[PDB]
Amino acid sequence: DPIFQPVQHELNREKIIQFLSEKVQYLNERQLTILDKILLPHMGQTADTRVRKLRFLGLLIHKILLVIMNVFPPTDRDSYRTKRVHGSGVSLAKAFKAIFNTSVIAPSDLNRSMEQSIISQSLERKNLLNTISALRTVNTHQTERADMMRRVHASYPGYICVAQSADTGE
């Protein structure tokens, strides 16, 4: 590794942690303590989950290697087994979480900026159908990727209307 030349062979764990800290015993722990919080937090954020974190990371590397061996195909980017739909409750809370620290903790602006996020879709009242379809619309935010994400994926039936889409434009 052109960047990690000194520690490529080192077994002194403290040396590895130290070099990582400068790239980013009390300081030895802190850079290791921040690591487990930012590395697979869903497994846990405490020192008693390091072994299972390593097992899970090994499993992830194993799955990537299985894909490179053509044992498995790449993950389907358009399948809905790996997708989630987030609206109102999730979307505002993360925006409220980001807005709460910068307007309250960091020092009437939070209300204005939250409203500004709301504006930045407009409820079009063409009819009742337009309203309940605008609230039933899922939004995704010249290549094979552009073709594939616009298709009728075989995972749609029953969850996404196989007919409804724009008929003109991008």
Residues that bind another protein (CB under 8 A): 38-43, 45, 60-61, 63-65, 67-68, 74-75, 77, 81-88, 90-94, 97, 115, 118-119, 121-123, 125-130, 132, 134-141, 143-144
**Residue number, 14 or 79, with CB nearest to another protein:** 79
**Residue number, 5 or 139, with CB nearest to another protein:** 139
CA atoms of 90 and 96, how far apart (whole Å) = 10
**Cβ 50 vs Cβ 36: under 8 Å:** yes
Give the nearest distance from C-beta 54 to another protein in angstroms.
13
**Residue number, 47 or 65, with CB nearest to another protein:** 65
Q: Which residues contact 14 (CB under 8 A, 6 or more apart)?
A: 25, 28
| Straight-line distance from the first to the last Cα atom of the chain, in angstroms, rounded to the nearest whole number | 43
